[PDB]
From Swiss-Prot:
Belongs to the SfsA family. GO terms for molecular function: DNA binding. This is Sugar fermentation stimulation protein homolog. HAMAP family: SfsA (MF_00095). It holds the Pfam family SfsA_N. It comes from Pyrococcus furiosus (strain ATCC 43587 / DSM 3638 / JCM 8422 / Vc1). InterPro entries: SfsA, SfsA_C, SfsA_N.
Amino acid sequence: AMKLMEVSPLFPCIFLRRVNRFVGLVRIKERIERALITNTGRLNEFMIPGRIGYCTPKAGGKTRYILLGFEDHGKIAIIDTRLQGKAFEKIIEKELLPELEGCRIIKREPRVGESRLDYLIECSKGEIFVETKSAVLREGEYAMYPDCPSVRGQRHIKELIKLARDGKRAMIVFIGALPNVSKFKPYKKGDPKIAELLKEALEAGVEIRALGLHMELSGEIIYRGELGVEI
Ligand SMILES: [Ca+2]
Ligand SMILES: [Ca+2]
């Protein structure tokens, strides 16, 4: 394990209810507060009235707090996809993935086919498109994706497959931002098309990685290393 970054300040809160896919209500001390949710998943196991979450302030505009994660086995599971992405960016910056040494992000959200993928990364010998996905659904030692059907994700995997068949470099990285997981697999029930598409991706040449991450109550974000991938 090693430290990537720190989030400050971090406020414990009580999760009250999800208003819609973008917003939740939480209790912070005396106050009921609107908190941004940046994760399109159901997060049914986390979004339970009474559960302890962790928020950070947001300077402007619509909402003043971001719900970053939830208490999970004494640590914090990171649900916020923006934070997960920032953690990934630190991994790239610090060159902590040997295969991506000497590589850096040159474009964020470039258009690819009918969609956009997270990153275009430039290396010494060429470029690589990298899509990162949240994997915070737990089954024992596994982090899983997704927790419900994702058309957005089906599209992304299709564009990755097409890149690889065109002989371009393509990668999907699952961010297993849960403490105490050592492996990754697709949650077939959540989206059987995605599980089928990930198999097709492997065969086509799309590189698949999964990373273990969590946040400590201190705000420190910890990179545990890679998770064992099953597809
Ligand atoms: Ca994206
Ligand atoms: Ca993404």
